[PDB]
């Protein structure tokens, strides 16, 4: 009955990549942990369960552009990044 349990019930969600079962779709947007396809991604979140969601591309940021506004940095931070 394991395959029957993971085929029936309300935990079913249609998607362009195919039918997803077992996971629960949510409206919150987060970074793509595991790529499913067609922008949908899955991750483990709080009890704990396997959620499905539209991957968030990132935080939106409306730049305050104007014909006379300029931003100048008043500090700096030395950083190190590893590459392999």
């Amino acid at each position: 009955p394991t395959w029957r349990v993971y085929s029936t019930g309300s935990n079913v969600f249609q998607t362009r990549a195919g039918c997803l079962i077992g996971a629960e779709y949510v409206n919150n947007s987060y970074e793509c942990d595991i790529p499913i396809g067609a922008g949908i991604c899955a991750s483990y979140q709080t009890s704990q369960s396997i959620i499905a969601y539209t991957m968030s591309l990132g935080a939106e940021n409306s730049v305050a552009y104007s014909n006379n506004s300029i931003a100048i940095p008043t500090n700096f931070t030395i950083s190190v990044t590893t590459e392999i």
Binding site: R16, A17, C32, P35, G37, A38, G39, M55, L57, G58, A59, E60, N61, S62, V63, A64, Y65, S66, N67, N68, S69, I70, A71, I72, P73
Partner: protein, 313 residues
């Protein structure tokens, strides 16, 4: 420059046997070939999404330009996104999409990870960053600055003093707008500029068609309809004939998966080139002569295309 290809995948057992249990039993003798072959296709499939990620995901924040497009006279309407349109593709991205123009035998086409809408969103974000903050957003946080000033000191990278730009702002604006109009006409015209992407699509399509067509070949067997041999022949002679057909189909798949690997390596050598081109020609100002288009490079704008990217230098 092309960036990826259709994420194709094939069920080895379905293509070789198509539900024939006898053929499957014979295929068991060949061992891990189906797993290893399908393992090779999965790698290519992941490679496509990796390439697209390395090309367009270089921006960490989804910037957006304000509604007051007072860019010192420069009209950037043709490249900015169309809010009145359902898809948020730019105007020039509508000509690109319109200009560019199987499952039966176990073949499958997985959808790309990133949809066209999100790809267009990344392009719009990059345009917003380049238009409103120059190269500052590439290195770190986006710093707003007037576009006229950006172009002004961008000329310092070409050894020309900014006084020339400020003295000829109107003329530069007119020339830029006219040039944009020429690009619009060129893509709107019958020009074959998009041949590079069309060739990739056609190559993969005809390759798949060749693979399907190969099934009709008997490879020296009495016939190509698998059920026909099993109907007309008893199990003893059927084994030698079905073995020949199995060998032929396996050979075809091997040829199909070997060409795909080579074509994937090439298209990923192109992807890396595109990524470096975007990082240098969009997020900065490269002194490398003729790298970012012919002539001294000022800036570049990227525009989404099917399976590729189109740069306006």
């Amino acid at each position: 420059l092309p960036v990826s290809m259709t994420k194709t995948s094939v069920d080895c057992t379905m293509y070789i046997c198509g539900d024939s249990t006898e053929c499957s039993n014979l295929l068991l003798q060949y061992g891990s070939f189906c797993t290893q072959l399908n393992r090779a296709l999965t790698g290519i499939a992941v490679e496509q999404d990796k390439n697209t990620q390395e090309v367009f995901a270089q921006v960490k924040q989804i910037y957006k330009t304000p509604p007051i497009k007072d860019f010192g006279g420069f009209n950037f309407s043709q490249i900015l996104p169309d809010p009145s349109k359902p898809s948020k593709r730019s105007f020039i991205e509508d000509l690109l999409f319109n200009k560019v123009t199987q499952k039966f035998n176990g073949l499958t086409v997985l959808p790309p990870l990133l949809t066209d809408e999100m790809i267009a969103q990344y392009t719009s974000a990059l345009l917003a960053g380049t238009i409103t903050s120059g190269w500052t957003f590439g290195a770190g946080a986006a710093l707003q600055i007037p576009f006229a000033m950006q172009m002004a000191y961008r000329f310092n990278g070409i050894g020309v003093t900014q006084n020339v730009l400020y003295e000829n702002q109107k003329l530069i604006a007119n020339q830029f707008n006219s040039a944009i109009g020429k690009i619009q006409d060129s893509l709107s015209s019958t020009a074959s500029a998009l041949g590079k992407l069309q060739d990739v699509v056609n190559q993969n399509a005809q390759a798949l068609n060749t693979l399907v067509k190969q099934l009709s070949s008997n490879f020296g067997a009495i016939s190509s309809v698998l059920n026909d041999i099993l109907s007309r022949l008893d199990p003893p002679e059927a084994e030698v004939q079905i073995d020949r057909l199995i060998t032929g189909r396996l050979q075809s798949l091997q040829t199909y998966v070997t060409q795909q690997l080579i074509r994937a390596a090439e298209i990923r050598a192109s992807a890396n080139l595109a990524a470096i081109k975007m990082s240098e020609c969009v997020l900065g100002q490269s002194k490398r002569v003729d790298f970012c288009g012919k002539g001294y490079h000022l800036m570049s704008f990227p525009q989404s295309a099917p399976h590729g990217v189109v740069f306006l230098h």
